Amino acid sequence: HHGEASPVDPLRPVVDASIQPLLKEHRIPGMAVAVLKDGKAHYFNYGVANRESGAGVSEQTLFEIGSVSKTLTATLGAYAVVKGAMQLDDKASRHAPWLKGSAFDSITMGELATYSAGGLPLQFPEEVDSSEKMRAYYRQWAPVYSPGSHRQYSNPSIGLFGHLAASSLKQPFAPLMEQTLLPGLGMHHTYVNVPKQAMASYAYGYSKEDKPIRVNPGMLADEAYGIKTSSADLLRFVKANIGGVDDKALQQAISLTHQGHYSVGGMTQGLGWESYAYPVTEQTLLAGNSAKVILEANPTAAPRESQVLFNKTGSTNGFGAYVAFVPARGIGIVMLANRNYPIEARIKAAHAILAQLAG
């Protein structure tokens, strides 16, 4: 492209300098990046969304965001709190009579949401592939740790929280999310189930062997890791987490997702969101998002006292996402890739970009 005008956005060189080495190094087919600064959204797009169509990534491209979905699930849950349909200290079996008689008689909704129920695993056992088998699994589950004592990052945990939260509101999760929560968040290009009308915008994910893949149906996938969104919509969510929204209940729910419950090292666990004192060292940010924190059980420590950075990683077999933002500084970043590349790479690059945005 020698002789073409270079893009005019003065933030382009900052983003490029961090993102282009990322795409080359881990051979990422496409990434949509969106950045907030001084009340304005800046979109930077790289590569291709679908190798069959050759279509370039844009801020309208739909990516799987994996566990970033948990921030939306948690917001739905907080929304049920605000509406009075549940409290975080409710026993889980209050909201599901099929749970009465089990350990979930003594486990709170809050503990489900914050992966501190007592050692629920990261994933369902593979044989748990139906709603009936799911119910059986929960009723027979044996607590490993006492409730509240340990964080074990778990899809069955926040998955069940999302599920009972929607049950408290007398609506199935996916319609509730798409019809009430997401439109209130201004997220009109975000889906649990991507409709016919929007499929052409849906990227393919790409495995380590460069095979085109999309997320597999699994139990409570909708609740735990099943959202598809664009970088523009996700930046609207960042903005909603900073400036707020017009729906009064949704506004409260957003604030509730920021409230800390406990900490692990420098990370403080909120509802969905994980938070850090800002400015935050790269090492601290990497530690909070490390294999140790993600994969193994960690003891719960006292939460950080209520400036702050909020963040969440998301991954599926073919996608890698990350979002971080600092409300006190009006800055944020959304990075959505159609390849599941290392979390450490995501944090380092976001780290770097946010630091230059902070000025």
Ligand SMILES: Nc1nc2c(ncn2[C@@H]2O[C@H](COP(=O)(O)O)[C@@H](O)[C@H]2O)c(=O)[nH]1
């Ligand atoms: N070893 C292992 N890693 C997982 C499993 N599920 C997700 N991960 C990884 O854990 C990290 C965090 O997931 P995320 O929070 O980004 O969805 C990602 O690197 C993701 O690929 C799993 O079942 N086993």
